[PDB]
Amino acid sequence: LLVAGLKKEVQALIAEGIALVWESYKLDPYVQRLAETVFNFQEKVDDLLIIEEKIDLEVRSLETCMYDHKTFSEILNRVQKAVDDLNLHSYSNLPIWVNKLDMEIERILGVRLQAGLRAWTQVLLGQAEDKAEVDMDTDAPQVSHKPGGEPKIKNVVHELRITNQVIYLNPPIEECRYKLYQEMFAWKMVVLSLPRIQSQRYQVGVHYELTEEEKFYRNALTRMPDGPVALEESYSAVMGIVSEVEQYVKVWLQYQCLWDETKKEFGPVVIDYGKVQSKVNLKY
Amino acid sequence: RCNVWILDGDLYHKGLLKFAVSAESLPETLVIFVADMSRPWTVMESLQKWASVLREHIDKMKIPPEKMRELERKFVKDFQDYMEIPVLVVCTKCDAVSVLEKEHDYRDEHLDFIQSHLRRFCLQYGAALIYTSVKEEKNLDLLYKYIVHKTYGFHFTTPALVVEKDAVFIPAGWDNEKKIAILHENFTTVKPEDAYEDFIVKPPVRKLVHDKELAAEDEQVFLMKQQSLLAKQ
Numbered sequence: 175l176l177v178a179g180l181k182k183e184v185q186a187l188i189a190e191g192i193a194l195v196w197e198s199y200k201l202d203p204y205v206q207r208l209a210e211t212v213f214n215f216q217e218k219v220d221d222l223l224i225i226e227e228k229i230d231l232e233v234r235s236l237e238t239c240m241y242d243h244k245t246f247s248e249i250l251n252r253v254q255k256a257v258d259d260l261n262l263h264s265y266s267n268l269p270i271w272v273n274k275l276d277m278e279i280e281r282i283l284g285v286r287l288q289a290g291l292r293a294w295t296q297v298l299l300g301q302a303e304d305k306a307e308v309d310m311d312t313d314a315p316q317v318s319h320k321p322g323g324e325p326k327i328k329n330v331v332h333e334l335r336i337t338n339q340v341i342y343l344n345p346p347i348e349e350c351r352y353k354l355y356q357e358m359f360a361w362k363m364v365v366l367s368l369p370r371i372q373s374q375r376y377q378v379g380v381h382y383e384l385t386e387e388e389k390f391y392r393n394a395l396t397r398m399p400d401g402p403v404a405l406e407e408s409y410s411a412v413m414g415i416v417s418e419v420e421q422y423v424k425v426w427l428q429y430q431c432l433w434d435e436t437k438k439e440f441g442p443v444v445i446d447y448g449k450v451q452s453k454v455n456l457k458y
Numbered sequence: 459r460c461n462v463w464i465l466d467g468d469l470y471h472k473g474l475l476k477f478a479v480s481a482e483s484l485p486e487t488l489v490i491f492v493a494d495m496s497r498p499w500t501v502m503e504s505l506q507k508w509a510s511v512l513r514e515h516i517d518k519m520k521i522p523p524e525k526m527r528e529l530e531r532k533f534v535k536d537f538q539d540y541m542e543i544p545v546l547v548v549c550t551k552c553d554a555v556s557v558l559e560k561e562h563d564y565r566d567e568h569l570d571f572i573q574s575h576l577r578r579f580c581l582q583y584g585a586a587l588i589y590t591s592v593k594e595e596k597n598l599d600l601l602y603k604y605i606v607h608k609t610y611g612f613h614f615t616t617p618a619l620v621v622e623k624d625a626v627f628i629p630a631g632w633d634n635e636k637k638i639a640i641l642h643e644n645f646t647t648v649k650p651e652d653a654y655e656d657f658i659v660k661p662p663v664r665k666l667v668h669d670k671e672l673a674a675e676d677e678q679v680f681l682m683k684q685q686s687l688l689a690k691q
Contacts, residue, residue, distance in 0.1 A: 181674035269668065270668075348461060
């Protein structure tokens with residue numbers, strides 16, 4: 175597509191020569207004309223092959239690169255510059271090829287985003303495998319980082335305290351619900367907040383409408399190969415750990431009727447009750 | 459502290475609704491539906507989309523019919539017992555009406571058309587209508603009071619306003635077809651039975667209409683063309 179405009183020009187001059195004859199002296203200007211056009215067609219084709227392989231390598235890197243925004247965003251910076259060079263030399267059909275490449279990039283951001291959720295879900299549930307369990311018999315160096323990365327959900331702590339014979343949770347299971355989803359929302363922004371490639375970025379002040387889905391890959395969560403199952407898995411983990419903490423907090427709230435191990439962990443969620451444990455012992 | 463759940467607009471995420479509402483939590487759930495007044499032409503259609511999606515969700519939930527009849531009895535009891543599950547329609551970015559007066563040459567008739575349609579829809583589903591503008595901070599406290607009233611059973615005293623074009627507030631049970639008939643008087647070119655799509659048109663936004671994919675003719679096809687040209691000569 176990119177060489178479509180240049181190739182037709184040669185066909186036009188070829189079409190012109192198909193009418194010419196040796197008896198005309200128009201052959202000799204034509205010989206000069208065809209050589210220049212064919213010479214340009216060879217050069218620009220050679221330029222694209224160099225650039226296109228770089229873009230092919232760069233997009234391939236997205237599959238195997240580390241799962242962090244900077245690592246992704248750096249890669250998406252390289253590909254944008256190459257496309258800007260394509261826009262800079264005035265190649266044909268660039269939005270189509272860019273639109274195809276843009277679709278391909280989102281697809282790769284789909285699988286990495288799918289891996290990121292599942293790695294995050296494993297970390298949330300405690301099913302994330304520490305690197306101690308990575309088998310040492312596999313002599314192949316595992317330099318290829320995990321496709322889902324190594325999500326680190328900061329340990330969540332809530333407060334179970336009693337104030338004047340009233341037991342309450344300082345961090346509510348609703349704020350725990352808020353916190354746990356907020357940590358998740360950070361992880362999806364590893365991918366969904368990446369810059370979207372624009373064919374006409376190099377045009378500044380171009381009068382084209384740009385929304386967030388145009389600006390970023392906000393639609394990669396719809397490009398998951400496994401569908402929304404990974405996302406459904408991700409939230410399903412949150413409810414259960416929330417649900418057990420809802421259950422675990424309930425049995426302590428039952429002891430309020432007394433008036434009317436010091437901590438427990440649910441994956442990243444931590445509940446601290448050593449303070450209330452003391453007064454429960456005294457009241458009992 | 460009331461649990462809040464806002465679903466992604468895409469139906470690709472509709473399956474998340476099971477994590478938002480359950481059998482035990484359904485009576486405790488208050489449903490809020492957003493109506494976009496910056497894009498009024500998709501208001502009714504998107505509203506039926508979301509209401510339908512809620513209908514299939516409650517269909518999947520598999521509640522006993524006795525419990526379903528009990529919930530409907532409670533809801534209708536709340537309905538007729540109104541004097542001066544639940545569903546609450548909130549209109550957002552109503553100040554865009556001021557743009558509609560300029561950009562699309564709207565008048566009070568179009569506003570009567572859309573709000574009469576919305577009130578009739580609310581009657582169809584027995585919902586409460588309110589008009590809001592965060593940009594202008596309109597009816598935010600009224601909204602908050604009404605939510606607290608309907609969820610926690612708190613008191614509520616504000617009366618129903620249906621006169622102001624972009625601040626209409628109709629609590630549950632106030633609306634009726636006879637009460638809706640006041641707007642039909644103000645019509646002078648449209649009729650209450652006239653279609654929504656015909657009177658209010660979806661503008662054809664001037665997106666960058668992409669050009670045809672121009673592709674270089676293959677060597678074989680171009681040379682068959684040249685064969686055709688040479689042969690006739």
